[PDB]
Structure formats: C-alpha cells, structure tokens
Subunit: 204 residues, 5 copies
C-alpha cells in the first residue's frame, strides 16, 4: 500500500491498454456505499470513471459520464442519470452513494447535491471484484473499448461501506475526508498496466 | 399526522403508479387559497406538481410546469400561464395564490413575483378532493399518464384558505411559514402507494 | 380623482374589450411632453403601452413595444424606434419625451438613456384626446386589436407638458417624481370598462 | 471657436443630406495622428464614424464600423481591421492613432488596447481636407450614401498631430483630455448642414 | 543581444515572408524544457506560435493554436491537444513544458493548469535548430505557409532546459521570471527579416 496524498494518476493518451487495477479484500457483498474522487478531463465524448465488474457480471458498479453535465450510475446492468450545471473544461469532485433498502442513489458534484434517483431496491452488489480506472470493462478485468477510455487526471479516491451524511461529503470536497474502509487514497494498493504516470496534484 | 420538517418525498423513477395521496377534511368549497412548496427535478419535459380533482371534475386545481421558465395554474378546466428567468437544473420554491372575487392568480418563484393573470372570477373550487403528488389525475384519484409524471423531490408543502401578503410568502421562502390550515407539512396526513421514499432535505 | 400610490392596474387576460380610459382637461395642443410609467408583462409579441388618438387622427401619440429590447414612439402617424439590452421577463420603468422645436425623442429604460431619434419637427400633437391603456386604438376611443393588447401590470403613470431634465427622470425611476400636470398617478381620473383589477404594487 | 464641452451632435435620422463639416488650419501633410471621440448608435449595419477626403483622393483617413466588435481604419484607400468584445447597444469611446515611420495603427476601445495592425509605411496623409461627420464621402465634401450614414450621437472629438502615449489616451477616456491641435471639442469651428441637433451629453 | 524588457514584436499583417529568427547556442539535445511567452492576436483561424525545426526534421517542437480554447504541442511529428475556457479576443500568457522520462506535456494558460497529456517518452528533441516566430516552418528555416502565419503581438519569451515548478510558472505570469538559459527576453539574440516592428508592451 502507498500514500498517494497530493498526487494524481495521469492517463496521458487514448488507448484500449492503459489502466490501473485496484485491489481491495472484499469477501462479503455490498448493501451500502459512498465513493468520492477528483477528476480532470478535456474529453467531450462519453467515458468511464469507475468500472467494477464481478465474475460473469458486467456493469455491476459503474460511474459513467455521458456528456457535459450528465452523470450515470449503474447498479447491476440498470442505470440512473442525473444532470448538473458545469463548466467545460474544469476540475470536478464527484461523490456517489447507494443504499439497498431504499434503492436511492445520491450524486454530489462540487459539494452540490443533484436530484436523487432510485434503482435496484433490495439488491446486493457482489464481492471479489475487478476494479479498473482509465478503462471500462466488458468482462472480468478486460474487454476494453477505446471510445469509453478516460484520458486525463484522477485523484483523491476514497470508498466507504456506508452512506455518508452531507457534512462528511463536504469534508471530502474540502480535502479532509473521514477514514475510508473499502478504498483509501492514503493506503492504496494498486497495479499500473500500461502508460499511466504519477504526478503532483496541481489543480486543487 | 406526521411532521415532515427537514424531510422530502422522493419520486425516484418515471411511472404511471407511484404517488402520494394527501388527506384534508374539506367540507366547504374554496374561494381563496395560497399553496407553497419546494421542488427539485432534472426533467426537461412537462409534469404536474399539484393535482386536485373533484367528483367528475378534472383539472379543478392543477399546478403544471410546461417547460423551463413556464408555470401554469388550472382553476376549473381553465388555464393561466406566467413566465420567469430560471436555471436548469436548480431547486425552486413555488407559491401560487388565487382569489375568486377578482379572479387573480399570483405566482412567486424563489420569492420573486411573476406577472398576475386572471381566470374564473366568481367561481368556487369544490370540496371533497382527491389530492395527488407525483402524478396528474384524469379522474377522481386515478387515470394517470407517464408523460405527465413527476420524478424528483418535493418538500415544504403548506396550503392556506386565504391570499397570503408579500411578507408571508417571503417567510415561507426563508423557511419560517405562518400556520397553515388546509395542509401543513408539520402535521401532514399522507398515503404512499408505490415507490416513494422519505429522505432528509439536503438542498436548502 | 383617486390616489393610486402603491397600486397597479392589472390587465389579467388577452381580449379586444378590457381597457382603462384616462380623462384629462386639456384642450390646448402639445408642443413638449414627458411620459413616465412602470410596466410588467411576460408577452413576447408586440403590444401597445400608451394609445392617444384625436378626432380622425390615429397614432397621434403611441408608445409601442415591438419585441424584447425595441421601443417605438409614434408622433402623428410617423414612428421612431430605439434599442436596449433587457431581461425577459422583467419589470421596466419607461420614460419617453418629445420636443416640437428640434423633433427629438428621448427614451429612458430603467434610468438608462437610449439613442436619441427625431421625427415631426414643428408639429403639434392635438388636444381633446381619447387616452386608452390595455388596448391600441384605430379610431377615436375604439377599433381595438387582440394581437396588440397589453396583458400585464401598469403603474406609476405621470405625464408633464415639458421635457424633463436627466435628474428628474431618475427621481421618477427612484419613485419620488416631481408634480405632474397632464396626468398624475396621485390624482388620477380614470374609467375601467371590462376586466381590469386594482391590486398593490409588489414588484418595485 | 465654440466650447462644445458637455454637448453632443445628434444625427436623428437616416439620410443622404445631414452632416457636420469640421474646419481646421492644416497646411502641411500628416505623418502622425491620434483621434479621440465618443459615439452612441443602435445601428446594426455598417457606418462611417469620421470621413477625411482631400482633392482628388477618396478615403484618405476613414474610421468605419463594419459590424459589432469590428473597427476599421483606411489610410490612403488601404484598409486595416481590429476585433473587440463589446455589448450591443452600448456607448463607446474610440481612440485611433497612426505613425508613418512604422505604419502602425493603434485602436483603443473603452480604454482597452486592440491588436496593432500596419498599413502605409512611408506615406504622408494629404493636407487641405474636407472633414465630415454623419456621412461617408466619395468626393471632396460630397457624393454620399444612405447605407453608410451615421444615425446617433457624437461627442468629445479631439485630433492631435502626434501619436499619444497610453496615459493620455486614458485621461481622454476619463474625461480630462490634453489640448488638441487639429480638432478640439472645447474650441471647435464647425458647419451644420441639414438636420443635426446639439443636445447635452446624457450618457458617458 | 538586446534587452527587450517592456517591449513586443508586432507582426502587423498576413504574409508568407515576415518572421523573426532566434539564435541560441544549442550543441546538446533537449530532454527537458519550459517555454513561456505572452501573445495577442484577433485571428480566428489556426496559427503557429513557436516553430523549431532541425536538419530534415519538421515539427520537432511546435506550439500551435488550433482554434479558440485549443492548444497544441508537437514533439517530433507527434501532437498533443488540450482545451481551456478563454475570451476571444484577449491577451494570453502561455507556458508549455515537456519531460522525456515520463513523456508529460504541461500547458498553463493565464496561470491556470490544463489537463496533462503525454507523447514521445524516451525521445530527445535535437540540437542546432532554426527557431522562427511569426511563421510555421516546413523545412530548415523556410517553406512557410500564409494560412499558418501569426499576425499580432509577441512578448516576454523565456525558455529553460528544465521542467518549471507551479510557483515559477506563476512568477513568469506575474512578470518576474527566474533566470532563463536557452532563451531570455532580457538578453535576446534575434534577426528580423521582413515587416516586424518593435513597440512598447501596452497590454499587461
Ligand atoms: C448506454 O447504451 C449502451 O449500453 C451498453 C451497456 O453499457 C455500456 C457502458 C458498456 O458496458 O459498454 O455501453 C454499452 C453500449 O456501448 C451503449 O451504447
Ligand atoms: C394543454 O393541452 C392539453 O390539455 C389537456 C387537459 O389538461 C392536461 C394537463 C391533463 O389534464 O392531462 O393535459 C391534456 C392534454 O394532454 C394536453 O395536450
Ligand atoms: C408597423 O407596421 C404596421 O403599422 C400599422 C399602423 O400602426 C399600428 C401600431 C396600428 O395603429 O395598429 O399597426 C398597423 C399594422 O398592424 C402594422 O403591421
Ligand atoms: C493537423 O493536420 C495536418 O498536419 C500537417 C503537419 O503539421 C502542420 C502544422 C504543418 O507542419 O504544416 O500542418 C500540416 C497540415 O497543414 C495539417 O492539415
Ligand atoms: Ca461494461
Ligand atoms: Ca464497454
Ligand atoms: Ca387532468
Ligand atoms: Ca392527464
Ligand atoms: Ca392605431
Ligand atoms: Ca391597431
Ligand atoms: Ca468614400
Ligand atoms: Ca511544419
Ligand atoms: Ca506548414
């Protein structure tokens, strides 16, 4: 594990090969979660932000950007889309949460709450995942698409096993998040597979 | 009755089923009224905000959003439309009032007064209603349309039997309204019929 | 005569009947004038603001709005048009002045001076008029058109027999005008003929 | 020899008649100049702002507005254009300087410097001119057009036989200029031909 | 060498002839660099900013503007493009850096960092160059193109043999840069070949 504080993963070109694999010891399936990160891209096409696929289970947990202003969350093949007013090109802090009991999906872009949507109530997002950044998975760890690739900079990635209250999301936005148990940017276990460079975070 | 202070009804998807019925003991017909609420939607199509229908009397009292900036009030099949400058998508506080004697309809969007229009002078809006949120009624409690459905978040619903002065509308906007006698968000008698979740109000 | 201070005439619908006649005991013809008022409409089509017609003399003195930003003054069948940057929909304070000696027409929208235009130098605008608001006249007191009708709110109407200096126009804009001799909103002699309601001025 | 300070020339209509001739004792040809004025027009089409024509030479010195955000300078029939961000309709202060040794043309719009352009290096702009305002000349003091005429207001017109530094430019924009040797608004010899009125400067 | 402190090179027209050659004693090839300058143009088409070509090696180091908001860097025939929000027309301060080890290219427009891109990792940009401003080279010192020509003003050109930290880029933006070893605007060795004039920098 590495402390990636004040650092970023830079995906410098468009490809179907460059990605980062993220290792987490997930034995038990997800009921509740929150996922916070910082992203900087000048791409006007659609791309993947966070791709989580389980064994023969595609789009199990996917954070997808459709176009400028439109954000999508996939929970088990099913999607949900919410809109926001944003500047293109500009740095963005994204927080996304989901809860099984209600089926509610919360998106927070730049510490601002988007309209709540719901999908897959009573569902459990499966354990033992292949988590990739920079690429969208269409299988367990592979089957990438160049048109869905992320070219840009990714930082401040934290994932919790609970639904974070408004105060804690703003603490993450302000750059002082609470301890994260699934993924922590301060104790990150990663794997770089192609052309992905670690550089200091200069845009916050 | 429930106190729904600091809470919201979230209509998480588009359907022709999900709605909330609101129960009020209306014996005598309406001459004067004010109706205040908070709404948050990222829908660019037309939808209903407040649907009140009486026994064989469709669009008796309807608050309808046409498109971005355009708001409509229906008093007994007859409509009236007023315009405003607004951001899409964004949280909105709506106040609408009507008076029988003059026929005047006042709309206040974000504590800002819109151009006064008039309809149905000398009319009485009938008692014993079926009041639904999330859906538009084309009968007494039913006959819904998916294209007119509200997907989003509704909060701070208050209804009075009088025409509220400018000072009181701003008190409602500021989040400290005067006692409401038809409907009160602090003592709400409701019925949830499908997929509608109660969550905290995070957008004020 | 009535004191209409802090009040407005509300033309609540589109029609070819609803209007207000304004009575003024002048029958000496006009050389110089200033005309100040407040208007609030969400109409995107063309309409009349002030219609003054004399015996067999149409468009003798007409304040006409063409579209958003464009204002027209008619002095004896002859028109003059000036442009401005304005928000739609929004409250507006209009001042218009004309002088016979030079032929100069001054328009002041929200206390801001527009480009000076000239028409009908050496002309006298005739006495004994039929002054209507809410409708455009095509005869002496009648011959209205629904497409030229004003639906909205009119307030703070004052008319003087002189060309007002910049300081006095701003005093009118600020809501403290100097004594008016043709028409005074503090001592108004009017006639309502259809559906026109008096309500308090809530938009200043 | 008239003090026109706090006053403006108004060209009230579109014609092929109305112009103001400006007289100056210039006997020697110009190698260096600076020309300062204020203009207010709501014309969308192309127009002449300042026309200087000598015996046998059309477009000797011409300040021409092409469209919104586009200013042109003609030196001895040769053209140069510069772009700017500006609001339509708006009052403008224009500063144009030219130097023969370098060929450099310097435009200043509302105290902001434009991209320097070059034309006619080594040229001497001919003496004994016919200087007109409101119209574009095709001959010595005549041969006008209706489509290039100025409808609007001109004020604060000064002309120097030197290239003025940034500080002097800015003081002219502030409304505290340096005394001018070719044309001075505070001691001007002019000639009104047709319908052109002198009214006070109410704008900037 | 000359002190060009508070001065600018003005390329006053479009041509295929006017350019400035910049002489630097480069014996050894470039691994790392930073290149800072100020540019002012009202051209809406594509142009070259900095052209560096080596012996039979076109687009070895090229700073190219595609359109408004889009900036390109060429390292050995290979390009990289990044986007920004900018006003047209407006003065701009550009900083561009490249590092061989990582292949990372950093663009800073008005002291604001753009999205990092990568190209040509492990490459060395060759020595003994022909460096031209105002024109794009398609050979060693020549083969220009009218459509790729820069018309405008260039200033504050500094080039270093290292990748400059964020603090130093802002020092360059603020107008107080650290000592430059490849090119220094304080001690510039240049050659003017056509119509290019030296004038004071009035736009900072
Ligand atoms: C959204 O419409 C379609 O959805 C499928 C499934 O979901 C993703 C993100 C994917 O997994 O590749 O895209 C697929 C396809 O390319 C899109 O046209
Ligand atoms: C507005 O034009 C039409 O009005 C009718 C009656 O009113 C509502 C709101 C309704 O009750 O369903 O819509 C109906 C229809 O779908 C619209 O095209
Ligand atoms: C402006 O063009 C035309 O002018 C005439 C005369 O003037 C008014 C305002 C009027 O008196 O009805 O409109 C008339 C007509 O409808 C317009 O198309
Ligand atoms: C970008 O597409 C093409 O690239 C080549 C190579 O690179 C430059 C800048 C050049 O060296 O002239 O332009 C060339 C051409 O004109 C462009 O259409
Ligand atoms: Ca997939
Ligand atoms: Ca895919
Ligand atoms: Ca209905
Ligand atoms: Ca319906
Ligand atoms: Ca008429
Ligand atoms: Ca008419
Ligand atoms: Ca000419
Ligand atoms: Ca080239
Ligand atoms: Ca080329």
């Amino acid at each position: 594990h590495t402390d990636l504080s004040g650092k970023v993963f830079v995906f410098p070109r468009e490809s179907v090969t460059d990605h980062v694999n993220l290792i987490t010891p997930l034995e038990k399936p997800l009921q509740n979660f929150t996922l916070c990160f910082r992203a900087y891209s000048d791409l006007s096409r659609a791309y993947s932000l966070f791709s989580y696929n389980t064994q023969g289970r595609d789009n199990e947990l996917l954070v997808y950007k459709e176009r400028v202003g439109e954000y999508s969350l996939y929970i088990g093949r099913h999607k949900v889309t919410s809109k926001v007013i944003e500047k293109f090109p500009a740095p963005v802090h994204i927080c996304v949460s989901w809860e099984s009991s209600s089926g509610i999906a919360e998106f927070w872009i730049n510490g601002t709450p988007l309209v709540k949507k719901g999908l897959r109530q009573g569902y459990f997002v499966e354990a033992q995942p292949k988590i990739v950044l920079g690429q969208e998975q269409d299988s367990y760890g592979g089957k990438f698409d160049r048109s869905q690739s992320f070219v840009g900079e990714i930082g401040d990635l934290y994932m919790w096993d609970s639904v974070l209250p408004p105060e804690n999301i703003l603490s993450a936005y302000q750059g002082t998040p609470l301890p994260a148990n699934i993924l922590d940017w301060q104790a990150l276990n990663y794997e770089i597979r192609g052309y992905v460079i670690i550089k200091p975070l200069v845009w916050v």
